[PDB]
Every structure is written in structure tokens, then in C-alpha cells.
Design a protein around this ligand. Sequence first.
Ligand SMILES: *[C@@H]1O[C@H](CO)[C@@H](O[C@@H]2O[C@H](CO)[C@@H](O)[C@H](O)[C@H]2NC(C)=O)[C@H](O)[C@H]1NC(C)=O
Ligand code: NAG
Ligand code: NAG
Ligand code: NAG
Ligand code: NAG
Lengths: 248, 149
Amino acid sequence: TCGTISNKTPPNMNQFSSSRRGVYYPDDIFRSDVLHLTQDYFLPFNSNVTRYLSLNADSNRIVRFDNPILPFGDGIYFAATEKSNVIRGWIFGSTLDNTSQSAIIVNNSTHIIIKVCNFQLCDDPMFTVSRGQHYKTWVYTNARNCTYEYVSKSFQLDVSEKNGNFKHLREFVFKNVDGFLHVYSAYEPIDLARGLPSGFSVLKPILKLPLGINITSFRVVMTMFSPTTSNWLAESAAYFVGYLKPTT
Amino acid sequence: KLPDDFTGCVIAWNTAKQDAGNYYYRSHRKTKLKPFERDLSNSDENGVRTLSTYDFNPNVPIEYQATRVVVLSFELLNAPATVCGPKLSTQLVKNQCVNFNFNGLKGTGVLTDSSKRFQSFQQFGRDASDFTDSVRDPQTLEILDISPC
Ligand SMILES: *[C@@H]1O[C@H](CO)[C@@H](O[C@@H]2O[C@H](CO)[C@@H](O)[C@H](O)[C@H]2NC(C)=O)[C@H](O)[C@H]1NC(C)=O
Ligand SMILES: *[C@@H]1O[C@H](CO)[C@@H](O)[C@H](O)[C@H]1NC(C)=O
Ligand SMILES: *[C@@H]1O[C@H](CO)[C@@H](O)[C@H](O)[C@H]1NC(C)=O
Ligand SMILES: *[C@@H]1O[C@H](CO)[C@@H](O)[C@H](O)[C@H]1NC(C)=O
Ligand SMILES: *[C@@H]1O[C@H](CO)[C@@H](O)[C@H](O)[C@H]1NC(C)=O
């Protein structure tokens, strides 16, 4: 089964700067004490980056739960500014429907799951949180022809609807080259209400996944919350998308 | 599709006796595959299949007979060895000019202990000339300096 959202407001797509944000290791070669000049898909400095929100404003009954199908370019830069682990992961593919294989990468509350299958996706792929704890996964209805799976070691997230401004900045770069999805990441403690903070970031290689799939599009998987297992509420989080461009 | 930067081996052999049956290949696509891309789509938008069929029988002409193919793709990074050839390991011989072979990294030079801090994954070190000046001994995990003979 799937969750549903009634009367989203559409994404406002405000734009912010990737100020030196989002550098990553371009190749697997170990280098030490050297200056390396290289042509690769990088996010240019001070590039425009588009903001997407999950937000709830009951005083206007305004909901935002911005999970559009975004293009995947020559790879993407992705950053979540976060306080309640609303951003749980991503769906990668082409059609993002059962006619093609898609890769789902999600922090399911106790395990990172990676699967490649002919998923039937929900219209709003999401997790749910009841009473501050994991409820149910509304990401996909059918798995069909799975051909890759990975599951990370056990953990627990904090899943409560923590109050205040954002405290976690999680950064990612995704590249799909020679049938590997490369994932790079960094984490930074933050204490800000809006936008990306300015600053230099280098993202470490986290994953090479031998997913032979065509990745053309992606979208984010997010939580909704409730105290009473119904009337699911959006909760304040923002994510930022930038596109890698061939640059030296 | 193989990449242009491919490193690896392509291996094939005839199996027309074993692999009788029906097997499929994509005869047409709107765009070529990327290297190591896969496309499992059977039906088109209307429902007719996009895949052609090999009819494999031992009775078909040789050119049409089934071959199995294995493609091995390799990497030789500055990272721990994961697959190795059957070579037996010798003792170390330090402070002498010797040939050496560490994880298939051949060379010649003088081996000594070293003060080098390596990274947890790192197997060898190089100076600004790419002269390999240190190597992790895969047996003891100790770091050896390599000097010119
Ligand atoms: C990967 O997937 C995309 C999307 O499914 C494919 O893009 C289609 O390509 C054909 C021919 O180029 C167009 O007629 C379609 O309109 C495209 N669809 C979209 C949504 O862009 C793409 O061809 C696939 N293969 C590769 C190698 O990218
Ligand atoms: C996007 O970039 C252009 C120039 O790079 C800039 O003029 C524009 O202001 C940016 N977007 C927004 C919403 O400001
Ligand atoms: C996903 O998390 C649930 C509980 O949070 C757990 O029971 C399940 O095992 C996890 N998924 C996988 C594939 O382990
Ligand atoms: C995919 O799964 C279905 C059964 O769910 C099966 O009929 C079909 O042949 C499978 N296709 C591939 C390519 O494995
Ligand atoms: C085998 O490798 C391990 C770890 O590298 C090492 O402790 C051991 O001495 C090596 N040789 C033998 C004979 O165990």
C-alpha cells in the first residue's frame, strides 16, 4: 500500500549558491602531496542550486512535500539540510515505473537498503513515523525482477520530529559511469534556518554499486509523521540539487 | 557494451551441445547502450516483444552455434589485493639489492624497515617522481622502504 498527500503546494524552486560546496575525489587513484589538474564532471563553484522543501503550515493548511522527478544529468550534487531525518533516500532510474529497472537507495530506519528491481513506485514514495518511531514503508508496491540487493549493518536513527532550526547538512554526489553508481558523501554540523551555508566541501567515496541500469531521472524519498497513525504531517526539511558539468 | 578504458579479459567457448533452447537478444533500440549498461525491457509500449530469439541447436551452422562468454573486468588500485595468482611467498631479504614482487608489483631495489605511516588500505607509496619508495608487506603488514640499488 501507499501513503497519499492531498493538496500539495507545487515546488517553488528557489535558488542558492554552491559556493565551493561539493568537491569530490574524481578517480580511485591514491595521491599524496600533489596538485592534480583534471577535467571531469564537477559542480562549478557558485553554481545555482535549486531548493526543494518538505514543510507543514497548518495555519494555512499549506503542505509542501517536494518530491518531483528530477533529471539526472552527468550526475548530480545533492545536499539535505535536516533536523528530523526527513530525507531517507532516493530512487534512480529512467521511467521510474515497472517498465524499467530502478535503483532504490533508502535509509530504512534500521538498515540502508539498496535494490534494483522493476519497482512499481508509489505516487509519493515515502516512509512513515508514528509517535516518534518507525511505522511503515510506503516506497513501492511491487518489486518484480530484482537483480541487485545490498543491506547495510544494523543501526537506529533518531526519528522524532525534533524542533528548531536545521542541525545536519548531509552532502552527496552521484555519478553513473561504466555501470557503477558512484556515491560520494560528506557530513557537516550546521545551525541555520535557511539555504545552504557557504563553505568548501570534499565528499569521500561511499559506494560503487555495479548497477547496470540506465539512470536518467531521480527523486527523493521522505518521511511523513503522525501521533495517531493517520492524517500524516509533513515536517520541515530542505534539500538542494545541483548538476555536475564537464569542467577542469 | 565494453568501455574504451576496459581492462580485463574476454573468454568464450562453444557450448552448442549444452545450451540448446531459446535465448534472446535485442535487435533494435532507439539509442546504443552505455558501457556495462543493461536493458531488461521485454514488451514495447503496445505489448509486442522487442527481443529477437536465438534458435540454438547443435544442428545449426557453426557461426550460429551457441558460445558462452565470460568477461572478467580487473582493477589494480593502491588497495588490498582481492584475487591473486598462485605464487608462493619467500622470506624477506632486507639491506640487500634484490628483485622483489609484492602483490604482483615487481621491481628491484633495497628493502628496509620504514617509519612510514600508511593509510589502512594503502599498499605502496610513491614520491613526486612516482618512484615507489615504500610497500606494505602483505604477510606482516609492516611497511618497507625501497631504495635504489
Ligand atoms: C535511458 O533512458 C532514457 C529515458 O527512459 C532514454 O531516453 C529516451 O530516448 C529516446 C531516444 O533517444 C527518446 O525518443 C525518448 O523520448 C527518451 N525519453 C526520455 C524520457 O528522455 C534513453 O534513450 C535511455 N538510454 C540511454 C543510453 O540513455
Ligand atoms: C541563476 O544564475 C544566474 C546566473 O548564473 C543568476 O543571475 C540568477 O540569479 C540565478 N538564480 C536566481 C534565482 O537568482
Ligand atoms: C528495514 O527496517 C525494518 C525496521 O525498521 C527492519 O525490520 C527491516 O529488516 C529493514 N530492512 C531490511 C532489508 O533489513
Ligand atoms: C521477470 O519476472 C516475471 C515474473 O514475475 C517473469 O515472467 C519474467 O520472465 C522475468 N523477466 C526476466 C528478464 O527475468
Ligand atoms: C599470513 O597472513 C597473516 C596476516 O597477513 C600473517 O599473520 C601470517 O603470518 C601470514 N603467514 C602465515 C604462515 O600465517
